[PDB]
Amino acid sequence: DQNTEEMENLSDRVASDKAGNSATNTQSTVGRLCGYGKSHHGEHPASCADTATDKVLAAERYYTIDLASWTTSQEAFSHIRIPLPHVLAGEDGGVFGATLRRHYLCKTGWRVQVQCNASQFHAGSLLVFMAPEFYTGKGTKTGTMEPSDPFTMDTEWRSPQGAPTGYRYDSRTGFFATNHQNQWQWTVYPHQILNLRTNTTVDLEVPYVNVAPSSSWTQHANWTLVVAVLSPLQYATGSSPDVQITASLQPVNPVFNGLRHETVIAQ
Amino acid sequence: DQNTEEMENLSDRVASDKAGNSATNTQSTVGRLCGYGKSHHGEHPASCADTATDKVLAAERYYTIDLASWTTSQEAFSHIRIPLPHVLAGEDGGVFGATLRRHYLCKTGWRVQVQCNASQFHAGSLLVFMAPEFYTGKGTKTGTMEPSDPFTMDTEWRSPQGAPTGYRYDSRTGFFATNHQNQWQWTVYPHQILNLRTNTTVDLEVPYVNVAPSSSWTQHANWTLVVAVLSPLQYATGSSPDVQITASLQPVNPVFNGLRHETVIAQ
Amino acid sequence: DQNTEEMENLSDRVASDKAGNSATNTQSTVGRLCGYGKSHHGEHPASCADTATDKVLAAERYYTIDLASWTTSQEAFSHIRIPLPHVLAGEDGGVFGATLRRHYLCKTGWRVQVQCNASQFHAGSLLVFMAPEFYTGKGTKTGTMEPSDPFTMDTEWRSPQGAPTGYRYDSRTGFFATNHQNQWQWTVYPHQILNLRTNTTVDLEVPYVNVAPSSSWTQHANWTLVVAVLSPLQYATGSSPDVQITASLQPVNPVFNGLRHETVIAQ
């Protein structure tokens, strides 16, 4: 189901989204999940007496960057996580990031687009889904208890472990931990599939939900994005192995308030 | 002509037929020949005073089985015949077959679907057509005159013979016989083509026509189905030779009457 | 953009043009440029008192012939020219050519169709465009000054020269000549692209424009057709190198006048 079409990628499968002074195109879409059912109204935080910095064009655009390389080698449910805000955080994050750390609080929603184009003699299936409270880390900390690098952008892929007991942490054992995940239910999150067969692209938009109408970006990361693979990349001797996966994102109608003087640290 | 579409098989080319508690699907159809122009009304045989066993759900479904293997080897107009009723006849024919031989007479029409899926780097063309009075046999009989096995389902394919003279039968010669066929006109029968190129499927429905409104299934077989090939299967060194041909059929609105006590023989 | 579609070539991309007793078909069109914006009305030359030979069916059809072979070897902007009228001129030009040289003057417009079909594992792009006053020749003349064979149909392809200075002509040098062309602007002419990828065909129709409403076909050729290539033919070891390029043309509503007695010469 969707319009008439293909070897080549056609019509009601060609979509475009313009935002700011950055404009996108895909000639082989299957939708765009507006995850949950509502978007984000630049509804001012009721929390603050701060009549904040609103409707700035300059930050409300599409920042694009590379996540990783997909290749024949990888095993199912191996995964790659992208926390928002903390990856659009500075340098690579335009005027958004700047105004982002000059301010105490933000409240935004994200509109994401992950791209991975192949060829009709390629098999595989990439699962893309946005989940708020989730896990990052990239580590078991040094020498003193608690837990390595959530802000880092998983440089390489992590190993589906024959068992949650969600990478607990201080030399121990017996039993599980509150960072569990059942990568086996990991399709209750607003998601969308990327089937080299069907899909060259996948668009997801998600509203604002933390514990407070606005949160602080120096200790939390309300949503982590996950580009982890559910049916690997077979390739027949001829053919383009190098399956370059790219992601391009857009904060939707952020509302910043609580302004001050350029946050200082990232190792 | 038919909707917009392809390498992949699309839209007004996706059809589904549900019957009983068996439901079909094809994503690369080209039609469905309602052969002759009328179907079969559960019109009760006027022949009998038997207010017969009608509208049974349980038998009015889609029985599926394998006919044969299509392969690079075969020559044009080589053929494979499937007599109805006598193949849905018992065991492999559900509640239809049972109620079929517990009854003296039937009157039905058939809705057939033969399937053979390939790949766009494959050439060939399969001709599928239903003809009532036709020929089966599978033989020149033993030692005494007349003619081997019509009820059998041609286990393997038979050889287009450089000439009808429709396999006459008692050591002879000079001249032809009433079981002729001009496989050269063998496209006057309700038919439909199966072009690996165009077609992955072919659907045919045919009404009731014998000599009597109801016939007896122990000496006649009013219709024989023929899955015989008109442009062979070339394959280029890589590629899936094994071209498995499958057929799935459905009796449409059979009307049985003249009931009694399980018919006895098949060698 | 254009209807839903492909590996195979579909629907609002299937066009047919019937003219006289010659009828065309293409299952992978992208348009038909009616170059300039107006066609040709059998508007009688106002120039002559000759109530000419009009609306003849027999000449107003599609003459088809082969121009050349496209192959992996050729370099960009290499070109092949087809002057009209002088190629439909006789023998190969039906009743048109005959009635053409039995008459002093003609006035017509052309409807052209150049065809070059390939395969989806082929890359390249053929530029097709009609320009009136242009250049032919096929030569630097013999021993006495001025300039080899405009009437000849470039038997083989000519070499894009690192510079117009439009093949001037009597042993010289320093500077350019009035037969310049900037094959670098050679897309201001009514044109149409032929992208093995997109295109298997290209249809162009052009009205009447000379210096006089009717011209004389023994000294001028008001339009030359050019089938010269802008992104060569790569082919991957398997595959049909032999890229046969064919052209089929039709004079639209010619109006002949000024009749006399079969023109005599062509070496």
Curated annotation (Swiss-Prot), chains A, B, C:
Domain of life: Viruses
Subcellular location(s) per record: Virion; Host cytoplasm
Biological role stated in the UniProt entry: Forms an icosahedral capsid of pseudo T=3 symmetry with capsid proteins VP2 and VP3. Together they form an icosahedral capsid composed of 60 copies of each VP1, VP2, and VP3, with a diameter of approximately 300 Angstroms. VP4 lies on the inner surface of the protein shell formed by VP1, VP2 and VP3. All the three latter proteins contain a beta-sheet structure called beta-barrel jelly roll. VP1 is situated at the 12 fivefold axes, whereas VP2 and VP3 are located at the quasi-sixfold axes.
Protein name: Capsid protein VP2
Biological source species: Theiler's murine encephalomyelitis virus (strain BeAn 8386) (TMEV)
Complete-protein stretch covered: 148 to 414 of 2303
